[PDB]
Amino acid sequence: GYVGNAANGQLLYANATLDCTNCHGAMGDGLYKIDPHATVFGQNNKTLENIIAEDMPQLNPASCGAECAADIAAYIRTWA
Amino acid sequence: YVGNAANGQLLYANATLDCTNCHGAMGDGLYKIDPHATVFGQNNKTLENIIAEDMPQLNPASCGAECAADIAAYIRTWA
Amino acid sequence: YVGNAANGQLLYANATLDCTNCHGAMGDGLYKIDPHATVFGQNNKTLENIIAEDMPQLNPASCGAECAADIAAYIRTWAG
Ligand code: HEC
Ligand code: HEC
Ligand code: HEC
Ligand SMILES: [Cl-]
Ligand SMILES: [Cl-]
Ligand code: NA
Ligand code: NA
Ligand code: NA
């Protein structure tokens, strides 16, 4: 399995093109909230990695796939 | 002088130098930085010298040779 | 209690505390922090005590004695 790299995720989350921070804030307390402790996300109870891979960023979800998502997820866990 | 990347990470994020506003957190902002390239600009400068001589644009003298080297050392990690 | 600079780095960058919004990543933001100084403000407080008692402005109590000591230990490293 891939194992997310939090250091990569720090930079990927802040990436100007992905633009996560514009919608979610620096640590998920912006316009749309992210709970960094939750293990299931959305109506389909996806993992953090899969919700990011499949659905984020909204502009173009395919621009952050599985490894990107795994890295970002590892970084998001540190928010708590 | 040999760049210190821990220093470089803070200097790149420095609020006065403000590199991130123009270049993003990892060089994918409005103006791109390619962390793989070894020559930069029309005069084929090193990463260190392009930063020292030309950046930030507001006042290039605010990040001189040592600052540039530390920031360059950090930017390579984006590869 | 002896501050843990590694943890200080994490706390300083935490968006709930939001120290970087006002002070910058290395104390060169809107409000400066001098990492060499040993007295701060008009009651000549220690670095730890100014943070514990007064920062962040949104809610001083969100960063107590331990938090302040860790962050202070990190701030000293900016001198390098
Ligand atoms: C322009 C809008 C927009 C952008 C850009 C965007 N998001 Fe979202 N995101 C949303 C909205 C809207 C939701 C659903 C509301 C919510 O739960 O926060 C959401 C939900 C999420 C959730 C589920 C949150 C929860 O607690 O249920 C995660 C995780 C998330 N986004 C991460 C990211 C990451 C990582 C990026 C980019 C790297 C990103 N988002 C980019 C708008 C955005
Ligand atoms: C307000 C604008 C602005 C600020 C601030 C700024 N730059 Fe730049 N930078 C540019 C522009 C414009 C170019 C040339 C176009 C390009 O290469 O993206 C450039 C070019 C560069 C290049 C060469 C990239 C290339 O491929 O040719 C590097 C490296 C760079 N800047 C680093 C920095 C660093 C390090 C800082 C601050 C610590 C900084 N810049 C601050 C606008 C800025
Ligand atoms: C939204 C504003 C704001 C936030 C958030 C904030 N500060 Fe401050 N801080 C100030 C202001 C204003 C001063 C006093 C004015 C000055 O020093 O110019 C100050 C003073 C300080 C001083 C004394 C510096 C001196 O010599 O004058 C330290 C140290 C400091 N803050 C650290 C922190 C730390 C650590 C955090 C959060 C973890 C924090 N601050 C959060 C606004 C902020
Ligand atoms: Cl970026
Ligand atoms: Cl700064
Ligand atoms: Na995605
Ligand atoms: Na310069
Ligand atoms: Na406090």
Residue numbers in the entry:
A (entry chain B): 1 to 80
B (entry chain C): 2 to 80
C (entry chain A): 2 to 81
Authors' text:
We therefore set out to characterize two previously unstudied proteins from the shipworm symbiont Teredinibacter turnerae that were initially identified by the presence of carbohydrate binding domains appended to uncharacterized domains with probable redox functions. One of these was TERTU_3803, which contained both a CBM10 and a CBM2 domain attached to a range of distinct modules (via flexible linkers) that did not bare any sequence similarity with catalytic domains typically found within carbohydrate-active enzymes. Using a ‘module walking’ approach, we searched for other genes coding for these X-domains. This led to the identification of TERTU_2913, which lacks CBMs but contains predicted X122, X183 and X132 domains. Taken together, these sequence analyses suggested that TERTU_3803 and TERTU_2913 could have a role to play in cellulose metabolism, and furthermore that role is likely to be a redox one given the presence of cytochrome domains within their linear amino acid sequences.
TtX183A, TtX183B and TtX183C, which all derive from TERTU_2913, were expressed and purified from the E. coli periplasm following co-expression with the cytochrome maturation machinery encoded on the pEC86 plasmid. All three proteins underwent crystal trials but only TtX183A and TtX183B formed diffracting crystals. The structure for TtX183A was determined via single-wavelength anomalous dispersion from the anomalous signal generated by the haem iron to a resolution of 1.4 Å. The resulting model was subsequently used to determine the structure of TtX183B via molecular replacement to 1.8 Å resolution. The polypeptide chain in each of TtX183A and TtX183B fold around the haem to produce a tertiary structure dominated by α-helices, as expected for small c-type cytochromes [Fig. 2(a)]. To examine the structural similarities within our TtX183 domain structures, we compared TtX183A with TtX183B and found that the structures superposed with one another with an r.m.s.d. of 1.12 Å over 59 Cα positions. In the structures of TtX183A and TtX183B, the haem propionate groups are highly solvent exposed where in CjX183 a loop was found to interact with these groups. This is likely to provide an easier exit route for electrons when O2 is present, explaining the apparent lack of stability of the reduced state for the TtX183s compared with CjX183.
